[PDB]
Structure formats: C-alpha cells, structure tokens
RNA sequence: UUAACGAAUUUAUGGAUAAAGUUUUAGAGCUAUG
DNA sequence: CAATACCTTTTATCCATAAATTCGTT
DNA sequence: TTTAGGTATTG
RNA sequence: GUAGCAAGUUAAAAUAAGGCUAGUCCGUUAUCAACUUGAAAAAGUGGCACCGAGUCGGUGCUU
C-alpha cells in the first residue's frame, strides 16, 4: 500500500513515500529520553545529507613520503656504519655532533660547531666552501688528501638527495661534448669502411643533435647537412641510434630477419652480440662510440652549461648560480645606493616585504621576488644585464630549487665515483667499500617487489629466500625477486566470478583457447538435403573439424567449414549453417605461435604436455623481465632444443581471461563423471552450452557453484566491490540504510514500488564556425563578426553553422530579431547541437507529428551536405534531417528515439538496483523462480529535469534545501506513473529477468500523458487500456503534488560524523609561548625549538566535575564541552577519568559524559537550532519554508537561460514576473522573521536591509538573481561571505558553545524520524 | 566491457622514486653612541 | 568577552591491475 | 581547488 | 636601546605524536544517532485513522 522514491547524490540522499493516490503519508512518532515532548508528528519525507566521502589518495601519498623518510634515514645510516670504525679514529664524536645539530646548545651535549668542534676552523670551512656544492667540486678535483669528516660530508650529500631514477643504464662525465663524441663516431666509421669514407669538416653537430626538436627531426636535419647520404644508409641508422630511436639495420647487410635496437628497451647487450657475430667482432667498436655519443645527448639537455674544464659538471652549475648571485646582488646592492638609497632598507633588511631580505631570511618564493622587483628594476640605469637575466628566470639564483630534479641520479654518480677515486689512494676502507657505497647511492627496491614486510604489512608481498635482514648489497640473495613479481600481479588479478575461490587462468591460455572454440561449436546447426530437420554439431565432428580446421589455420570461416570439412570429409554437396555467424569468432591463437617456435605438432597434442604448456603461458604472460623468464622456462629446457627457447622467450602475452581451470576442467558431475569441457564436446544430440551446463537443476554444477558463492558477504563488501567513485558509494550505503529504516516504520511490510535516480566549449563554438566559412569561402563571417563569449545563446549559434539561411525555407535571415525564430528539433522531443535547428517557423517541417517533410527535404537535401562537409553539421544531425527519404523516421527508428532515452545506462546505478531487488525478494516459490515482490525501478535524471520546468514545479538550489526530498518526490511519481500504464516497458526500467520487445510501435516522445493539455487533447482520467486500472487524474492528482512540494516540514538530517585524519595542521610553526603549540617530538619544548598547531578535533566530550579556581584553590562545580583531538582520542578511550583529571578536572560524574560527535544537534529556546561544529565553534540550525510561488517565481525571475520553451508560453512566464513583482520585499521580508527568530545575526541582516533598500531602481532580472546570494545566511550549514551587488557581506561565526549545554540534545535515527531528546541540566 | 576481439581515455586500488616547503641549530656581524 | 582578521605544504616521475566509457575493427 | 574551523589581538 | 655600514645563495636534523609485531614494517581511506544485548561482526526496540499546515497541531478509536 506504498512506494519509496530514493535521489542519490554525492553530499545527500533524497528519499519521498507515494501513494496510489500519491499522497505523502504523516504518522505520529514516539520520542525517547527525560524531556515532556514524547511524542512527534512528522512528514514521511525528507533526506539525509552528509560530508562527502575521501578517496584513499590523499591518504597513500602521505604513505609514500612517509616510507620516503624511513628509507633515507636509513641510507645514511649505511654510510655512517662504514665510517664509524675509521672515524672514531679521526674524531670521536664527529657523528654525534650531527645527530644533534637541531638541539639548543642549552640541550647540546657536545660542541656547538658540527663539522669541527672548534670555531675557528668551522668558520674558514665556510670561509673556503661556501656550498656545499663547491666542496663537492674540490672533492672531485683535487689530488690532495682531503679530511674524512669533509669526504663523508660530500658523499652523504649525494646520498641523501639522489635525483631520479627516470633513466636506466649508465651516463658518462666524458661524455660532455658531442662533437668530440660525434668526430669519434665518424672517426671510427672511417677505421672500418676505406673504400666510402665520410667527412666531418663544417657541421655543427653541438647544435643540430642537442635540440628541442623531434628526435626523427633532428635526424633528417644533419643527414641533410653532411654531404647527402640517405637516412637509410649505414651513417644514418647509427645517428637515429644515438638520437633515441629504433633503426632497422638489415637494410645494410641485406640480413635474413629484421634486427632492431633501441637504447632505452632492455634487449640490447645480447641483441648486438646476436647480430654482430654475423657481421664480426671488429664492428662493435664503433656501435659503443655509437652508444656514448647518444649518452652525449640525453645529457646535453640536463647540464646545458660548459662543463670541459672538470669532472664535477653538477657542482660546477652550482658554483656559477652562486658566483652570478654574488657578481649581481653586488651591482643590484651598488645600483640601489646610487639612484634610490631611500628604499634599500625596505629591499635587504624587511623580511615581511618580498624583498631579498625577504627572498632569503623571510618566506618570500623566488617567483614572489622576481615579481616584486621587476618593476624597481627598470626604474634605474644599466638593468639590461640584470633584466634580461630576469626574464631568463636566472637572476640571483638559490642553489637548491624546485627546478632540480630534473637532474638524473647518475650524474651524482658520476661525482661521488670520483671522489671515492681520488681518495682512496689515501684510506684504505674506501677501497674496499667503494662498490659497497656507489650501490647505497644507485639502489632503489623494485616496485614489484614492494615493502620488504615481515607478514606485518597490508600492501606488502614479497617472499624471501633466507629470513634475514635486506641491505642493498644482499638484496638478490635474501629476496626472491621473481615469486614477488609473480605475487605482485596476481593480486590484482581478477577472480573467477562463477567460482570465486580459485584465480582466473592467462587470457591467452590454451586451455581457455579450446573452451573458448568449443562453445562457439557446440551450438552449431547444420542442415543438409538427406535430414529432415536440423542438428547440432555430434561429438566427433567438433572433435573433427577442430583437428582438422582449427589446428590447420588460425582462423576459420564459414565457407571454409562447408567446403573443407562437409564436402571433403562428409560428401555432402550442398548444407546450409545456422548457429554460426560469418567466421567463427573463436580462434586458437596461442596454439599456432607455439606451433611455430616448437615445431612439434606431436608436442602440442599429447595430454601429459597440457600441464607444461599451461605453465609457459603463465609464465609467459605474467613476466616483464627478461631475466626471469628464462628461471623459470629453464625447468623445461630438457625437452626442447637450446634454439626453441631463444624463441620462447622472445613471446610475450598480455591480459587476463574470464574463468579459472578449476570452472572449465576441474568442476565434475557427481553422477555423469564428466566435466564442463567434456560436456561441450560429446554431449549428445543435444549439445549444450556454456550457460546452459551451470544452469541444469539435474547437474551437479547448480549444486556446486551455489555452495561455494555463499561460503554471502556483508553489505561494506558487497558495497565496497561497487566500481566508481568512493563517495557515492557513500550516498550508495546510506541510501540502502534509508530504506531499511522505512521498511521498519511500515510495520515491516515490503513495499511494491521503488524508484531510484542518481544525478551527474567557450571557444569550441568559434572554431566550428571559423573552418566551417573557409571551406564554405562565404564572406558571412566578414559581413558580421562577433565575439567567442556569445555563443552560449541558442538561436544566435545555430545562425552561424547555417550560415544565415533556413533549412526549411532557404533565404536570409535577419540578424536583429530571432526570438520570433523558433529552435527545431530534428526529432520531436534531443536539445543538443547535433538535433537542434533555428528557422522562422517550425510548421515549415511540415507535420509537426512527422520528420521534416519531403516538401522542404527536396529544396534543401543539397543545402545540407553542404554543411556537412564543412562540419556545420554532424553526420547524426544530416542523416535525421535526410531520413525523410527512407521512409521518414520509422516506427521501430522512432523506437530508437524514445527507447534509448528512458533506460538509464550507467552501469553503477544497475548495480544498485540488485542491491535493492536482491534485498528485498527472499522468498522463493516451490519452483526455482524468484518472487518478484518489489519492483525496483531506475529512474533516469532528465525526465524528471524537464517535469519541474514542463509543469510549474521549478527548482531553485541555494534558498533552501528541500529540493532534495523533492527530487525524490518527483521520482517516485514519474516512476510509478510510468510503470502504472506501461507494463511492456517493466523489463527496460525494473531489474527484471522480466521481457521486453522491440516490435510494438504512436509520439515518440514519451512525456505527454501527465500534461492536462498537450501542443499539437488528452482526459483527465487516465486508466491502463488492458487491465482499466486508473493510473493518473489530471484534475485530482496534480493539486497534492503542489500541495506536497510547498509543504514546510521535511525531515533534513545532516549525518553525524567523528572526524578522522591529520592530527593538526601540518605546518611547522616557529617558536612561540602558546600552549596550544604542540610539540613536534618529545624531547622538544616548542617553545625553543617551534611545533604544531591547530587540532583537528575528533569529537566533544560532555564533562560536569569540579575545577580549582583562584589563589583560593576552590572547587567549584563547572559544565562545559572537552575537545576530544584525534591525537588524545587514543589516550582518552583507554581511561577516560584518568585522562580527564590530567586535564585538570576534579570528581568527574563518568555516568553522565556524552561524546558528542560533529554535527551534533541541538534545540534551545524558541525551536532555533545549532549544530555543534566543534569543541568551541557552532553551525546553524533550520532552513527557511520559504513559499512555493517564491520558488517557482525565483527561477523565474533569475530567468534561467533565457527562456528554452514555447514562445507563447513564454510571455506567461514574463508576465509572471511582473505580476508578482511585489514579492521581491516579501522575499526580504521572510528572511528577516527567519533571522531574527533563528538566526541572531542582527550585524549582518542591518546592512543587508541597508543594501536592499539601496537597489530597488535595478531591474528585476539583475536584482532577483541578487537576492539569491542573500539566502547563504539563513542556509543551513557553515556561516561563509555573501556579497549583493558590489557589496560583500562578511560571516558571522558562533563562537561560543555556552548556550547550548543547557539545551536538549537531538539524537537522531538515519531518517529523522526516531529521536530520543535529553534536556541537559547539572 | 560487447556477441565477439581489439584500442584509447578517465576514474578507483597499489608499488617504487624524485625535487621544494617548513622548523632549531652551525655559518664569531662590525663601527660610532651610555 | 564578542567582533575582526588571518591562517591553512606543494609539485613532479615511472610501473602495475581493475571497471566504466567511448572509439574502432575482419 | 576553496571550506570553515584555530588562533591571536583589538577597541 | 638608536642611528650608520658589512653581510645573505650553503648545510645538518625532523617531517604526522608515535606503536610492537622491531619489519630497510606500521601510523590521515572506508565505517559510526540513541538505548537494551554483544569481545566485535552483528542482532533487538518505536499502535492506527481523520481534519488540517510556518518547520507538526488537534481529535476520535484502540492502548
């Protein structure tokens, strides 16, 4: 005797309850709790919202860095174990120093200066090395020794910050200048090849190779320059190998088979080797020079200064950013005294001012310094040096940026190498460890390997060989590097959905192959002349004609199955083939590639070789490395030839199939001892098929698959298997707990209907016009020009693709007057460009109940292609506006206009529906079939759109909330009316499996039976033709659905939450004397050393006890609101009054402390409400019933888009406008009531009244729209800014929680419907 | 996901890295003047 | 107190799986 | 990409 | 303490407090009104009809 009506969304979940007669039902409420009110009349309507659900990105970043951190500590740790022996002999407590660099030298346990205890030599280090970057170019250059605590100082550097690991294999610092690289290529090219000898001479190599330019263009631009050789020939494939490219060097020695190689892709050691040997051992001495100059290139990019003088490029870039910054703060220093010494103070010596005073000691980014100073910097002479050194973006440089990083780790490498080489002549560890330490700098875990866990990670899963700890250095032998990169896919490998215990077999599987063919061939039918009726394929013929055409070819067509297996096989001369389309769409690919490289058709058959083919396809699919493939397959080296497995390896498959070994080959009928595979071939004369098998109620596999599905899951699961986005899943719980509390307030009783619906090119508009007359070659676009902002208006766009003439009558048209042209649809309602026209009059068409007729089609069928080949039009577009002369727009086309529009296609929204329909229908019958006792119903989100704007029940946004519930209002009686006369389309919107046909076919626009009258007559009294039940009265119906939309009590509950995440705001703050500073580490006051700050509060905590007050120390008795912080909560929930009297309260009554979550509600006084924001902070209460004439005025008088409708419509709603022009101080007028009452923001309404009373000579359009902003103050939510016109209105925050503890607190069931009140008082 | 296969984008979940920011300390501030 | 103003770490790179979505095919 | 709660200081 | 002037670019150390299961692991996603029952997961609990409508009000019947 009713039906729900759900509206999901992202923040909120909108629900209504329909009647047969669509009333909204009311019922009285029992309340719970101390307070007199026990019980409450309430709305059986409403909504719920709620904060927005987090997607887990956010929060696995911070995991990335957070292991980051714990893996960079850990690198240097590395490098100090090595150095602790050797250096405690140099100093004792060199490491200890650093390790408390940050302490206070009150907190110091040992010297301030860190590198050196004394201060004298601490301050010539920075004397000498003012970076640490120049040190690290005297490391690399000198031959002296140098001391260890300066060595270690270096290294450590390099090792704590890398750069990337973008780049594989090896870069050299010889390697700098291409040129000398470049002649060494063509050197070399000439100790081999005398008889065609080439020449270096004027090119420019430097710049033509080192160039932005396509890695192809930089090719032809230097083939071009040397003396004309072809890109083919032998130089060019050896330039195109050093750019970074894949040549083909077959064409040279004329080779067999094609040969390539590329520099980034892995096989290229082996692939010279594999075609050098033909060639001969004496080529490869160029193809290294080859590969070194390439290595030229990609880092000619990266260290783009002169580098030839040192080893030590990197630093060297340091050490002239430096030497610049110095050479030109100097002049900027000077130039400042010499024509504006008033300002210099302000520039070096503010550091609140952006200035370099700000850019180094205050906050100030470089961008901010650049931007501040770029006008003082043309006010004085000889800024030219200066100013083009600022738009270079390369003036007073820092060192370290957030431009670095483009730097590769290798050339930090190739640093530290050189350090390690200089001194290692002088201490003997380094010698001996300098493997050891390059390995801490160029390792990094290889991400199919993953945390290297101890069983005690979630993400992790790696295996390990010995149980022992990892270094870097016995990384191979401790981890098993390939298993992990085996286990590493297959978690995220899909599972068998029918037997969801066991993993889903390689998509290119053999086993899948067959299954695969088999079914497509168990249900072939063939007829021939000797058989009366036809047959399906017997068990020998699959098995035959497998053997022979499927095995024979990879793919297999239908002519080839009559002619190469019926005729031959069977002499049968003439058959016709039913089940089969074209070809078969099966194919037994993975068998012939493996035919192929083995060469053993014996091999392939014998069943004792499936196991072993299997497996090389797992392995063969599932690995990337090349090296382990080869660990693996050499289990199967002993059958096959060393050559085969060259081959082998070479194969690589990609993707996952659909069903596991265990569905298609394991699962077995108890009785009939045969498998799903051994049913698809040999299953009688009755051939059966994939489908069919699970689904015979006399086979065991019904019986089978059922008991391991329900070994089902709880809702969080079956819920967080959804696909889509995290929080409307969200929306997706809460909508399935709304419906589950209704269900309980119904008396239990399971309701029969159930709607569900789920909501959701500036400058593209000019370009289609702009090409669209240089094609045309029309002067139209000339003869008027506009602008690219416009075109958001209708009727002027679609002037421009029609290039001024009419469709349907063919003239110009005039550019000033288009409101009296109407906008066409193509097809009688599409809104979009692709359906919508604009011509004088829409009867030129001709029936306004048919396509546009072939009275206008013959005038215009050529103006249109026109159009179209100057993409005025689009294809859909031109073929609905020809279809006039295929019969016109079909009965069964028409079909394909309505249909496609009704059905919602989103594949979550379905998902949703089982939710629902298998929630709802346990029972079942004595037969197998379901009970179909609620009719879940998905409810597109347009059809619903166009009825509030059809039928005067407009939607404004921002005044109110309700349209939530009125959303599901209009959903649940555009559903249930649809469904009521139209049980033939039950199976296209209910999940239903009921059935639906094509066939019957006369409006194609579905929307017509609500309206009382329709633009060309239909009775208020509208009943199903078949069953005569009345589905829709015009006259009765339509006034309650006005009556319920302006009703002024609905249930609007904001969900309570705990609020979770960062402990506080992440920002370090300096040091302060605030005890809301909150330390950073233990061992650190922030007072000395600066901490956190802000909070975040997890929930309140309700506390009545006692305090000391005074001098007196007084204990007097004290209510108030504790701030639960997410950082205490695990402190707070192991003891509570232990926890308490450490913040200072005395005799805590436990019994009575309410933790009170955010969002918590509460009433006080005269009904306004508050939401409990915070410990500290408020939210407000109530939205404001403003009335439904206002609504529909609204959004009628903010004049949403122009106007869409009907013209004459039109000037109703214009009319409307003025008619109740009034109201705009009636609107004003309630808001003012609705402050005062709830609001108590007297401040801000006083300047608001002041800025209403100041625009009433502004028109109405302008001025409504306005008046909108108006209604974020009395919104339900957070206080924010609002502005009228020019004048920004500013937030009024509550402050203070006092008022509410004596209030009574709203506990509130997840409808709004069951409550328990609690009057608090001490 | 279509029939059925492929391709691509986007979103979801995960791994391995990088460069900045922020905070305390170390980089003897001097010269007139109480 | 309650106004009033101010504050809130960011930006890159590579690899993988899966749905959903909108293109293609012989 | 802006919300809306901490935080400190004023008239 | 004020006025003058030199100066600045670099570094170490922390990067959610921290936890035990001590891993080159883990620590910001999801989930949550209330009350009874539960270690949790979870289960349990709230008569109806009519006239009406500024945020639910009244009446009749049962209770």
């Known amino acids: 005797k009713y039906s729900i009506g759900l509206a999901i969304g992202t923040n909120s979940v909108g629900w209504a309850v329909i009647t047969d007669e669509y009333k909204v039902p009311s019922k009285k409420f029992k309340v719970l709790g101390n307070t007199d009110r026990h019980s409450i009349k309430k709305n059986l309507i409403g909504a719920l919202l709620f904060d927005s659900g987090e997607?887990?990105?956010?929060?696995?970043?911070?995991?990335?860095?957070?292991?980051?951190?714990?893996?960079?500590?850990?690198?240097?740790?590395?490098?100090?174990?090595?150095?602790?022996?050797?250096?405690?002999?140099?100093?004792?407590?060199?490491?200890?120093?650093?390790?408390?660099?940050?302490?206070?030298?009150?907190?110091?346990?040992?010297?301030?200066?860190?590198?050196?205890?004394?201060?004298?030599?601490?301050?010539?280090?920075?004397?000498?090395?003012?970076?640490?970057?120049?040190?690290?170019?005297?490391?690399?250059?000198?031959?002296?020794?140098?001391?260890?605590?300066?060595?270690?100082?270096?290294?450590?550097?390099?090792?704590?910050?890398?750069?990337?690991?973008?780049?594989?294999?090896?870069?050299?610092?010889?390697?700098?200048?291409?040129?000398?690289?470049?002649?060494?290529?063509?050197?070399?090219?000439?100790?081999?090849?005398?008889?065609?000898?080439?020449?270096?001479?004027?090119?420019?190599?430097?710049?033509?190779?080192?160039?932005?330019?396509?890695?192809?263009?930089?090719?032809?631009?230097?083939?071009?320059?040397?003396?004309?050789?072809?890109?083919?020939?032998?130089?060019?494939?050896?330039?195109?190998?050093?750019?970074?490219?894949?040549?083909?060097?077959?064409?040279?020695?004329?080779?067999?088979?094609?040969?390539?190689?590329?520099?980034?892709?892995?096989?290229?050691?082996?692939?010279?080797?594999?075609?050098?040997?033909?060639?001969?051992?004496?080529?490869?001495?160029?193809?290294?020079?080859?590969?070194?100059?390439?290595?030229?290139?990609?880092?000619?990019?990266?260290?783009?200064?002169?580098?030839?003088?040192?080893?030590?490029?990197?630093?060297?870039?340091?050490?002239?950013?430096?030497?610049?910054?110095?050479?030109?703060?100097?002049?900027?220093?000077?130039?400042?005294?010499?024509?504006?010494?008033?300002?210099?103070?302000?520039?070096?010596?503010?550091?609140?001012?952006?200035?370099?005073?700000?850019?180094?000691?205050?906050?100030?980014?470089?961008?901010?310094?650049?931007?501040?100073?770029?006008?003082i910097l043309e006010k004085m002479d000889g800024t030219e040096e200066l100013l083009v050194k600022l738009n270079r973006e390369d003036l007073l440089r820092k060192q370290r940026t957030f431009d670095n990083g483009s730097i590769p780790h290798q050339i930090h490498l190739g640093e530290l190498h050189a350090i390690l080489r200089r001194q290692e002549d002088f201490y003997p560890f380094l010698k001996d460890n300098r493997e050891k330490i390059e390995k801490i700098l160029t390792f990094r875990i290889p991400y199919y390997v993953g945390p290297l866990a101890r069983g005690n990670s979630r993400f992790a899963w790696m295996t390990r060989k010995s149980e022992e700890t990892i270094t870097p250095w016995n990384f191979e032998e401790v981890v098993d590097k390939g298993a992990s990169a085996q286990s590493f896919i297959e978690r995220m490998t899909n599972f068998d959905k029918n037997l969801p215990n066991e993993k889903v077999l390689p998509k290119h599987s053999l086993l899948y192959e067959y299954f695969t063919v088999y079914n497509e061939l168990t249900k072939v039918k063939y007829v021939t002349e000797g058989m009366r009726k036809p047959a399906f394929l017997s068990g020998e013929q699959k098995k035959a004609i497998v053997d022979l055409l499927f095995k024979t070819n990879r793919k297999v067509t239908v002519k080839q199955l009559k002619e190469d297996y019926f005729k031959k096989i069977e002499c049968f001369d003439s058959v016709e083939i039913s089940g089969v389309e074209d070809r078969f769409n099966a194919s037994l690919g993975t068998y012939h590639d493996l035919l192929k490289i083995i060469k053993d058709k014996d091999f392939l058959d014998n069943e004792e070789n499936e196991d072993i083919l299997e497996d090389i396809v797992l392995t063969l699919t599932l690995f990337e490395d090349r090296e382990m493939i080869e660990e693996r397959l050499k289990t199967y080296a002993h059958l096959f030839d060393d050559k085969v497995m060259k081959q082998l390896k070479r194969r690589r498959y990609t993707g996952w199939g659909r069903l596991s070994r265990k569905l298609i080959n394991g699962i077995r009928d108890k009785?009939?001892?045969?498998?799903?595979?051994?049913?698809?071939?040999?299953?009688?004369?009755?051939?059966?098929?994939?489908?069919?098998?699970?689904?015979?109620?006399?086979?065991?596999?019904?019986?089978?698959?059922?008991?391991?599905?329900?070994?089902?899951?709880?809702?969080?699961?079956?819920?967080?298997?959804?696909?889509?986005?995290?929080?409307?899943?969200?929306?997706?719980?809460?909508?399935?707990?709304?419906?589950?509390?209704?269900?309980?307030?119904?008396?239990?009783?399971?309701?029969?209907?159930?709607?569900?619906?789920?909501?959701?090119?500036?400058?593209?508009?000019?370009?289609?016009?702009?090409?669209?007359?240089?094609?045309?070659?029309?002067?139209?676009?000339?003869?008027?020009?506009?602008?690219?902002?416009?075109?958001?208006?209708?009727?002027?766009?679609?002037?421009?693709?029609?290039?001024?003439?009419?469709?349907?009558?063919?003239?110009?048209?005039?550019?000033?007057?288009?409101?009296?042209?109407?906008?066409?649809?193509?097809?009688?309602?599409?809104?979009?460009?692709?359906?919508?026209?604009?011509?004088?009059?829409?009867?030129?068409?001709?029936?306004?109940?048919?396509?546009?007729?072939?009275?206008?089609?013959?005038?215009?069928?050529?103006?249109?292609?026109?159009?179209?080949?100057?993409?005025?039009?689009?294809?859909?577009?031109?073929?609905?506006?020809?279809?006039?002369?295929?019969?016109?727009?079909?009965?069964?086309?028409?079909?394909?206009?309505?249909?496609?529009?009704?059905?919602?296609?989103?594949?979550?929204?379905?998902?949703?529906?089982?939710?629902?329909?298998?929630?709802?229908n346990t029972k079942y019958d004595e037969n197998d079939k379901l009970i179909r006792e609620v009719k879940v119903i998905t409810l597109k989100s347009k059809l619903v759109s166009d009825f509030r704007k059809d039928f005067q029940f407009y939607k404004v946004r921002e005044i109110n909330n309700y349209h939530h519930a009125h959303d599901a209002y209009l959903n649940a009686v555009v559903g249930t009316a649809l469904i009521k006369k139209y049980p033939k389309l039950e199976s296209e919107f209910v999940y239903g499996d009921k059935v639906y046909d094509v066939r019957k076919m006369f409006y194609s626009n579905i929307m017509n039976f609500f309206k009382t009258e329709i633009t060309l007559k239909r009775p208020l009294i509208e009943t199903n033709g078949e069953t005569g039940e009345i589905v829709w009265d015009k006259g009765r119906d339509f006034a309650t659905v006005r009556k319920v939309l302006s009703m002024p009590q609905v249930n609007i509950v904001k969900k309570t939450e705990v609020q979770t995440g960062g402990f506080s705001k992440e920002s370090i703050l300096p040091k302060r004397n605030s005890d809301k500073l909150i330390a950073r580490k233990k061992d650190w006051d922030p007072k000395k050393y600066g901490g956190f700050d802000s909070p975040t509060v997890a929930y309140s905590v309700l506390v009545v006890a006692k305090v000391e007050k005074g001098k007196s120390k007084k204990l007097k008795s004290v209510k108030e609101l504790l701030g639960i912080t997410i950082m205490e909560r695990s402190s707070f929930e192991k003891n509570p009054i232990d926890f308490l009297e450490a913040k200072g309260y005395k005799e805590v009554k436990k019994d009575l402390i309410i933790k009170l979550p955010k969002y918590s509600l509460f009433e006080l006084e005269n009904g306004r409400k508050r939401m409990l924001a915070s410990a500290g902070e408020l939210q407000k209460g109530n939205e404001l019933a403003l009335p439904s004439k206002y609504v529909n005025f609204l959004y009628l008088a903010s004049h949403y888009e122009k106007l869409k409708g009907s013209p004459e419509d039109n000037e109703q709603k214009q009319l409307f406008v003025e008619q109740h022009k009034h109201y705009l101080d009636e609107i004003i007028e309630q808001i003012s009531e609705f402050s005062k009452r709830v609001i108590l923001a007297d401040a801000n309404l006083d300047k608001v009244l002041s800025a209403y009373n100041k625009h009433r000579d502004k028109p109405i359009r302008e001025q409504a729209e306005n008046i909108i902003h108006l209604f974020t103050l009395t919104n339900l939510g957070a206080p924010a800014a609002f502005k009228y016109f020019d004048t920004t209105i500013d937030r009024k925050r509550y402050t203070s929680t006092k008022e509410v503890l004596d209030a009574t607190l709203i506990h509130q069931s997840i409808t709004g419907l069951y409550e328990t009140r609690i009057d608090l008082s001490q």
């Open 55 to 375: 997607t887990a990105e956010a929060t696995r970043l911070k995991r990335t860095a957070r292991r980051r951190y714990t893996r960079r500590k850990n690198r240097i740790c590395y490098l100090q174990e090595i150095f602790s022996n050797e250096m405690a002999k140099v100093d004792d407590s060199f490491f200890h120093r650093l390790e408390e660099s940050f302490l206070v030298e009150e907190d110091k346990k040992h010297e301030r200066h860190p590198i050196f205890g004394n201060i004298v030599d601490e301050v010539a280090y920075h004397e000498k090395y003012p970076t640490i970057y120049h040190l690290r170019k005297k490391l690399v250059d000198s031959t002296d020794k140098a001391d260890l605590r300066l060595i270690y100082l270096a290294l450590a550097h390099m090792i704590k910050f890398r750069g990337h690991f973008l780049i594989e294999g090896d870069l050299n610092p010889d390697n700098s200048d291409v040129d000398k690289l470049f002649i060494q290529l063509v050197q070399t090219y000439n100790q081999l090849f005398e008889e065609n000898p080439i020449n270096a001479s004027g090119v420019d190599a430097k710049a033509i190779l080192s160039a932005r330019l396509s890695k192809s263009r930089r090719l032809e631009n230097l083939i071009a320059q040397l003396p004309g050789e072809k890109k083919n020939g032998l130089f060019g494939n050896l330039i195109a190998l050093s750019l970074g490219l894949t040549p083909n060097f077959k064409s040279n020695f004329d080779l067999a088979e094609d040969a390539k190689l590329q520099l980034s892709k892995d096989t290229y050691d082996d692939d010279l080797d594999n075609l050098l040997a033909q060639i001969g051992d004496q080529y490869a001495d160029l193809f290294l020079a080859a590969k070194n100059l390439s290595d030229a290139i990609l880092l000619s990019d990266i260290l783009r200064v002169n580098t030839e003088i040192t080893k030590a490029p990197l630093s060297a870039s340091m050490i002239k950013r430096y030497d610049e910054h110095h050479q030109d703060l100097t002049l900027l220093k000077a130039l400042v005294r010499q024509q504006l010494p008033e300002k210099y103070k302000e520039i070096f010596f503010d550091q609140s001012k952006n200035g370099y005073a700000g850019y180094i000691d205050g906050g100030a980014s470089q961008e901010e310094f650049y931007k501040f100073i770029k006008p």
């Open 671 to 920: 009785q009939s001892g045969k498998t799903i595979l051994d049913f698809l071939k040999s299953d009688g004369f009755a051939n059966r098929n994939f489908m069919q098998l699970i689904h015979d109620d006399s086979l065991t596999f019904k019986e089978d698959i059922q008991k391991a599905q329900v070994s089902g899951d709880s809702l969080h699961e079956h819920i967080a298997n959804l696909a889509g986005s995290p929080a409307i899943k969200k929306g997706i719980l809460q909508t399935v707990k709304v419906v589950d509390e209704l269900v309980k307030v119904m008396g239990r009783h399971k309701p029969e209907n159930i709607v569900i619906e789920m909501a959701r090119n500036s400058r593209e508009r000019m370009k289609r016009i702009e090409e669209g007359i240089k094609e045309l070659g029309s002067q139209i676009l000339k003869e008027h020009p506009v602008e690219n902002t416009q075109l958001q208006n209708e009727k002027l766009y679609l002037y421009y693709l029609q290039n001024g003439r009419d469709m349907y009558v063919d003239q110009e048209l005039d550019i000033n007057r288009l409101s009296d042209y109407d906008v066409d649809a193509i097809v009688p309602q599409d809104d979009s460009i692709d359906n919508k026209v604009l011509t004088r009059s829409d009867k030129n068409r001709g029936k306004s109940d048919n396509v546009p007729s072939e009275e206008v089609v013959k005038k215009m069928k050529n103006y249109w292609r026109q159009l179209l080949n100057a993409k005025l039009i689009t294809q859909r577009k031109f073929d609905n506006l020809t279809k006039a002369e295929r019969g016109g727009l079909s009965e069964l086309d028409k079909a394909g206009f309505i249909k496609r529009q009704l059905v919602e296609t989103r594949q979550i929204t379905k998902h949703v529906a089982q939710i629902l329909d298998s929630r709802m």
